[PDB]
Amino acid sequence: NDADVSKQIQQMVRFIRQEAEEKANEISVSAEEEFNIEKLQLVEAEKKKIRQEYERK
Amino acid sequence: GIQQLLAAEQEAQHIVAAARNAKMARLRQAKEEAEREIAEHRAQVER
Amino acid sequence: DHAELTTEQVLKRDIPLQLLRRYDNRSESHRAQLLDDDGPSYVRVFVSILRDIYKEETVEYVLALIDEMKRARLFHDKSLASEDTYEPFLRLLWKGNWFIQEKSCKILASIVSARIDDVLKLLVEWLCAQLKKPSHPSRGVPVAINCLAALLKEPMVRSSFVQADGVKLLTPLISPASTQQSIQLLYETCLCVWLLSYYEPAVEYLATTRTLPRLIDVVKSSTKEKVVRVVVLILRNLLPKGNFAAQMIDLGLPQVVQSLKAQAWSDEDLLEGLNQLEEGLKDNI
Amino acid sequence: PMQLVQIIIPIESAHLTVSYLGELGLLQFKDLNSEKSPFQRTYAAQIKKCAEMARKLRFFKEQMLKAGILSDLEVKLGDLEAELVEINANGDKLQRAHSELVEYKLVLQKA
Amino acid sequence: SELKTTLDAGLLHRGNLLQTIGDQFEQWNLLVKREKSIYHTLNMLSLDVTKKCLVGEGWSPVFATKQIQDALERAAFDSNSQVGAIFQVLHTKESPPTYFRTNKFTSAFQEIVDAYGVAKYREANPGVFTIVTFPFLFAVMFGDWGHGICLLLGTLVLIVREKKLASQKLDDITDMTFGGRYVILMMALFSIYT
């Protein structure tokens, strides 16, 4: 109550903002960036192999 | 108090678990989508 | 007017059916809350709310409201008909109006949710103009603190961040902050930089951004929870990129890396990530 | 008429809060976490590192007192102690060399 | 001669460095004391990772807790933290030890009386009566108005020199005597009256 409940709600808000807006956002954006890069990294090699096959043909 | 503080911790843990699953989900989805895209690109070479 | 600070006022400016106008005249998530009432009927008008805005006040109430959130990918959905409130932000970012000031970094990023990747791409070159001298109450640089991250770190604007010196103007964002709110803003900016370093073109753009001294100072002076977390994320992202870690290690990175025993920064997987970053910095030194 | 007081000091300012409380001092410390020994415990590992730094500082102060001196911080104190030890070792080596050379000079003069 | 000159130069440099090293260590002593206090608090009081804070409970004077907790919370807020420290109260059936507030002059008599023990948080405090009762009785056993003046004069010098006495150390018996200068003066005055 009063100061105690104010501290409780402040702790809840701070914890949710630190875990969601700062950390979970970091994991989500890292996951998105990995999704962008990783498979294109193999698509480039697949394109090179396809180009080599086309050159042979 | 202690129970009130525990709810925020549980919500944070659930959000952490969701973020952890998001990595594998995004990786697999992008892999499949870009496999389709690379197949289309290779088909373009035929044209 | 140009870009400003209190994004709520611009996001709730004079609207250019009724729910779309309310969204154009409601700040923050209240815009989406009011727009969702009419559903497709609101979306049909919200499409033209941002696709048919010409006056400075109307264009501001469109772009800032879009940045505040029908402002989501629904702006270019089926209920929007032929008109779209998402794609035109890319072309609007290159102008000089208040809507252009918002879309320079922030409003275009939010409108890029329909993808419409051009809106995300256009947010890099005009990022410096988005934060020229904001003093008024309106949308602008504070919105670009976090909203513009999803566009700048994206591969669409990854190379353009350093191509037009947009990231160069954002180099001192990782500098030490004298306020807790400023500390949080610097941590968010460093997290955006780390996310960009997690993108292939922006990885080289960060080196081309001429932000090495600021990153080194942030890493050496990383003491706050979020600030140290963002510094560790940036260090881990740029660690495999050769000089991006070697120069920091030669500048004193292992000195702060050795103090990882009491980091507790919650930098995602703080323990393993900090250990790997410290090992890499020590090896490179 | 004292009474129990229960509070939480966030880790972002836990050290600052402890320092501020110790500036004046109102409530005695509890003993709940003491059962976990200096082995890790809550922050006993950090307490162990602080104790090692304090031991290094005490050794430096004892060396300064032996030298007749007048009375990141821990790292600076350790660096200063190492510098003083190196200076003392250099002085002792030079004194030993001077003594050896003086003995040789006396022997050669007598010869 | 060259080696002796080099040794002298090295010793002079070491002494010059130690001149400031000791000055730094003077404040480093208080820094180490504060670090040890924080370490004891951490090792004695646990913490909650869920709360991301150091939490616990302990005895505190209600009058002190009226301002001390608020001051600590304000300092924590001024420490650039997202939120300040808490100031909540706690309750338990156990009776915490407590000490009555000691004045500058009453401290010596209170310490002398407390050598028999303590009491509850607000229980009986025989020190209040004995602060004057002991002078009111020890005077009779030494009643002679030619020596009580001498005793008061001896006590008076200790009170006057208190400014310098508080800094300079003295003999253990001398230090113990100087610790109760006011009590000695009161006893001497009572003896003079007797």
Coordinates of C-alpha atoms in Angstrom, one line a residue, chain A residues 8 11-13 15-16 19-20 23-25 27-28 31-32 34-36 39-40 43 46-47 50 54, chain B residues 1 4-5 8-9 11-12 15-16 19-20 22-23 26-27 30-32 34-36 38 41-42 45:
Chain A
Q8 CA 5.7 -2.9 -6.6
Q11 CA 9.3 -2.8 -10.2
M12 CA 6.7 -4.5 -12.5
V13 CA 6.9 -1.8 -15.1
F15 CA 11.0 -5.5 -15.3
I16 CA 8.6 -5.7 -18.2
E19 CA 12.9 -7.8 -20.5
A20 CA 10.6 -6.9 -23.4
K23 CA 16.2 -7.8 -24.3
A24 CA 13.4 -9.7 -26.1
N25 CA 13.5 -7.0 -28.8
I27 CA 16.7 -11.5 -29.6
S28 CA 13.8 -10.9 -32.1
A31 CA 16.7 -13.6 -35.3
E32 CA 15.3 -11.5 -38.1
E34 CA 20.0 -14.1 -39.2
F35 CA 16.9 -15.1 -41.2
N36 CA 17.8 -12.4 -43.8
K39 CA 20.0 -18.6 -46.3
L40 CA 21.0 -16.0 -48.9
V43 CA 21.6 -18.9 -52.3
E46 CA 23.6 -22.1 -55.5
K47 CA 23.5 -19.3 -58.1
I50 CA 23.8 -22.9 -61.6
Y54 CA 24.8 -23.1 -67.7
Chain B
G1 CA 3.8 -7.6 -3.0
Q4 CA 2.6 -9.0 -7.4
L5 CA 6.3 -8.9 -8.2
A8 CA 6.1 -9.5 -13.8
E9 CA 8.9 -12.1 -13.6
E11 CA 5.6 -12.5 -17.9
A12 CA 9.2 -11.7 -18.6
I15 CA 8.4 -13.2 -23.3
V16 CA 11.9 -14.6 -23.2
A19 CA 11.8 -14.6 -28.2
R20 CA 13.9 -17.9 -28.0
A22 CA 11.3 -16.8 -32.6
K23 CA 14.9 -17.5 -33.6
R26 CA 12.3 -17.1 -38.4
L27 CA 15.4 -19.2 -39.5
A30 CA 13.4 -17.7 -44.2
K31 CA 15.2 -20.9 -45.3
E32 CA 12.1 -22.3 -47.0
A34 CA 14.5 -18.3 -50.0
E35 CA 14.7 -21.9 -51.2
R36 CA 11.6 -21.2 -53.3
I38 CA 16.4 -19.5 -55.4
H41 CA 16.1 -17.6 -59.8
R42 CA 17.6 -20.8 -61.2
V45 CA 18.5 -18.9 -66.0

